[PDB]
Every structure is written in structure tokens, then in C-alpha cells.
Design an enzyme around this catalytic site. Structure first.
Site, PDB file in Angstrom:
ATOM      1  N   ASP A  81     162.689 113.459   9.071  1.00  0.00           N
ATOM      2  CA  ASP A  81     162.302 112.741  10.284  1.00  0.00           C
ATOM      3  C   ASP A  81     163.387 111.745  10.670  1.00  0.00           C
ATOM      4  OD1 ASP A  81     161.062 111.434  12.325  1.00  0.00           O
ATOM      5  OD2 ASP A  81     159.523 110.464  11.071  1.00  0.00           O
ATOM      6  N   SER A 135     171.624 110.535  27.494  1.00  0.00           N
ATOM      7  CA  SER A 135     171.949 111.804  28.118  1.00  0.00           C
ATOM      8  C   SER A 135     172.462 111.553  29.526  1.00  0.00           C
ATOM      9  CB  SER A 135     170.716 112.683  28.172  1.00  0.00           C
ATOM     10  OG  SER A 135     170.909 113.883  28.900  1.00  0.00           O
TER      11      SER A 135
HETATM   12  C1  LIG Z   1     150.652 114.481  11.178  1.00  0.00           C
HETATM   13  S1  LIG Z   1     152.242 115.278  10.980  1.00  0.00           S
HETATM   14  C2  LIG Z   1     153.419 114.068  11.473  1.00  0.00           C
HETATM   15  C3  LIG Z   1     154.749 114.394  11.259  1.00  0.00           C
HETATM   16  C4  LIG Z   1     155.748 113.505  11.616  1.00  0.00           C
HETATM   17  C5  LIG Z   1     155.474 112.258  12.176  1.00  0.00           C
HETATM   18  C6  LIG Z   1     156.611 111.342  12.553  1.00  0.00           C
HETATM   19  N1  LIG Z   1     156.924 111.457  13.988  1.00  0.00           N
HETATM   20  C7  LIG Z   1     156.037 110.586  14.776  1.00  0.00           C
HETATM   21  C8  LIG Z   1     156.325 110.672  16.257  1.00  0.00           C
HETATM   22  O1  LIG Z   1     156.270 112.025  16.715  1.00  0.00           O
HETATM   23  C9  LIG Z   1     154.131 111.928  12.393  1.00  0.00           C
HETATM   24  C10 LIG Z   1     153.122 112.825  12.050  1.00  0.00           C
END
Ligand SMILES: CSc1ccc(CNCCO)cc1
EC number: 3.4.23.22
Length: 330
Positions: free
Chosen positions: A35, A199
Site C-alpha cells: 500500500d 498530472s
Molecule cells: C478492506 S481491504 C483494504 C485494503 C487497503 C486499504 C488501504 N487503502 C485505503 C484507501 O483506499 C484499506 C482497506
């Protein structure tokens, strides 16, 4: 040093991507969501409330001879989508694709929100944003990339996400066979802790390119592409029958449609997202209304170049003294 790991979509829609990560001694392999929009490495664990575990693989620190409890440390995170998790903290050995960090903070969940419980394929998150966002208290901890950086051949990692197919995260090197043409680099602001960039504009399908600055973040942990309302309206206006649905929570479109591509600018370069990448399938099982992959950021407060955008590119997260982002077609 370098590392290289395959990343795999969790489902047929590419809702997220999981990458295997080795934690502890002997290794415990968990499949984590890498992430670039957050900065905590957290895992389902033997400490997670039992009713909140539903199929995930857990980290059991008591079975790792290299795990050490980080005395007094806790963590708690709330993500932009409303998801959350919290717990305590160990340090342990963590390896990705052959690249090893000793003493990595591994945040062990005691509690997770229902959205995590319901995603049996995601065993935790590995944050790759800037360590200023890490939530560990009272002593903030470093990301896996920050801990590895000095050892890497080059202080970079790359994201090469697949469309309906596996892809790759590389650490420490740029695979010049993984993209076409050149990589165009663009400036990053770290002031909000994200890989934040601007962008240079967009086009819809074969339409003319609109030169306009769009500030947003490169976020592998967000599924969709979230852009200003004006841009998103211009896109969906090209799809007969598409509409913004308050009940569904965004733009929907007839599943029988063939979607136009969407182009975004990176300096003078152009990344083309094929129309099919923008189709997220029926809004509910058996419906002929489909959910769009380009949505408004208006209610979010930031534009987000999530997986829909990033998987159309080979993306360099350059962690040099002054960080930058690179994008190439592929
Ligand atoms: C419930 S699965 C999940 C996977 C990644 C994240 C982190 N990104 C947050 C903003 O899209 C949050 C939830």
C-alpha cells in the site's frame, strides 16, 4: 541488495493485489496488500480477536525465535475508505522477494474492522508511503522500504501491477525489460506523507488532450481512480446510459457498454488506461448495471491514482534524497 516478488489480484475484478511476505524465524508467509498510500506493516495474528478472523493466515510471534515485543508500543489506523485496525508491535525479520530486513516493526492486530475480516485473501498490509505517516506510538516506526533503502543497489521500488493477471514489485533496481519507451519522472511532494504528484491533464477515448494540473497520490492500496468531478463527468458522458447513482455510491453504467479509454499526463508523456480496465462488474450479483472504475474525488479531499491508473503503467517510486515518481507505458 535487491528483491523481486510477484503480486496477484485477489479476485477477478482486480479489487486489490497480494504479495507473499516472509515474517519471522522459521518463516511465516503471509499475503500482504502493498500500500503506497500508508506506512504501517500490520498483520492478522494469534492476538487478533477470534471472531474477527475468517480465513486469513495469521502471524504467531511466539513461534518466531527472532520476534521481540516492542515494549509499550501500540498502533491504530483508520483508512480513507472507513476501514481500521489496531494492536501491539513486535520487531522481527521480514523478507520480500529475497530482500531481508532485520528488526522490522511488525504491527500485530488485536482488532480489525469488518471489511478486513470479510476479505479472507488479505493477511495484512505493507505500507510503502513515507514513514512520517506510521501510526506506532509512542515511538514511530519505519517502513520496510525505509529500513531497506540504504542496502539496496538503488533507493527505489517499482510497481508493475497486472490487469487480470499477476505482476511484480521490485526493490532496488529498475527492470528495463518491463516497460516500453522511456520512464518519465515527475516531482513529488512528501508534505502529506504520500507519493503526491501533479498530472498534466487527461483525455477521454480518442478525444483531445486537456492540459490541466491534477494533484493526486500514487496509491497501490486504492482500487479505483478518483479524480475531480469535472473530469469524471467528462469521462462518463461518453458512455451511453452511464449515471451517478447516490444509492450505489458512484457512477454506474450498462454492463453491455464498451468503455472508452482514459489517458493521463505525466509531464509530456501519456499513460493510456484501456476501457476494459474501468469495468468493475455488476453492482450486485446478476445485475446488468456495472460499477465504474473512475469515480469522483469530491467527497474524499484528494485525487487518487489507484490501481486502475497504476496498472496501465510501470511505476518507479524513487526514494532518493529528493523523491520522485516515474511512469512508463508497458
Ligand atoms: C478492506 S481491504 C483494504 C485494503 C487497503 C486499504 C488501504 N487503502 C485505503 C484507501 O483506499 C484499506 C482497506
Amino acid at each position: 541488495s535487491t528483491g523481486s516478488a510477484t503480486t496477484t489480484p485477489i479476485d477477478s475484478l482486480d479489487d486489490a493485489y497480494i504479495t507473499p511476505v516472509q515474517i519471522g524465524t522459521p518463516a511465516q508467509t503471509l499475503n500482504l496488500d502493498f500500500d503506497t498510500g500508508s506506512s504501517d506493516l500490520w498483520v492478522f495474528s494469534s492476538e487478533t480477536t477470534a471472531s474477527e478472523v475468517d480465513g486469513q493466515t495469521i502471524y504467531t510471534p511466539s513461534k518466531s525465535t527472532t520476534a521481540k515485543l516492542l515494549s509499550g508500543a501500540t498502533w491504530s489506523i483508520s483508512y480513507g475508505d472507513g476501514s481500521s485496525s489496531s494492536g501491539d508491535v513486535y520487531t522481527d525479520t521480514v523478507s520480500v522477494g529475497g530482500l531481508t530486513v532485520t528488526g522490522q516493526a511488525v504491527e500485530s492486530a488485536k482488532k480489525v474492522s469488518s471489511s478486513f475480516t470479510e476479505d479472507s485473501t488479505i493477511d495484512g498490509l505493507l505500507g510503502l508511503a513515507f514513514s512520517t505517516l506510521n501510526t506506532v506510538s509512542p515511538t514511530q516506526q519505519k517502513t520496510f522500504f525505509d529500513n531497506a533503502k540504504a542496502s539496496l543497489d538503488s533507493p527505489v521500488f517499482t510497481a508493475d501491477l497486472g490487469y487480470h493477471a499477476p505482476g511484480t514489485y521490485n526493490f532496488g533496481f529498475i527492470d528495463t525489460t518491463a516497460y516500453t519507451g522511456s520512464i518519465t519522472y515527475t516531482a513529488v511532494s512528501t508534505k502529506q506523507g504520500f507519493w503526491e504528484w501533479t498530472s498534466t491533464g487527461y483525455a477521454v477515448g480518442s478525444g483531445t488532450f486537456k492540459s490541466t494540473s491534477i494533484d493526486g497520490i500514487a496509491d497501490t492500496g486504492t482500487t479505483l481512480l478518483y479524480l475531480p468531478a469535472t473530469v469524471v463527468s467528462a469521462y462518463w458522458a461518453q458512455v451511453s446510459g452511464a449515471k451517478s447513482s447516490s444509492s450505489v455510491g458512484g457512477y454506474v453504467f450498462p454492463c453491455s457498454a464498451t468503455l472508452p479509454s482514459f489517458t493521463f499526463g505525466v509531464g509530456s508523456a501519456r499513460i493510456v488506461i484501456p476501457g476494459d480496465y474501468i469495468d468493475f462488474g455488476p453492482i450486485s450479483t446478476g445485475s446488468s448495471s456495472c460499477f465504474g472504475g473512475i469515480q469522483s474525488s469530491a467527497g474524499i479531499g484528494i485525487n487518487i491514482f489507484g490501481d486502475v491508473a497504476l496498472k496501465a503503467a510501470f511505476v518507479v517510486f524513487n526514494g532518493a534524497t529528493t523523491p520522485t515518481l516515474g511512469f512508463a507505458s508497458k
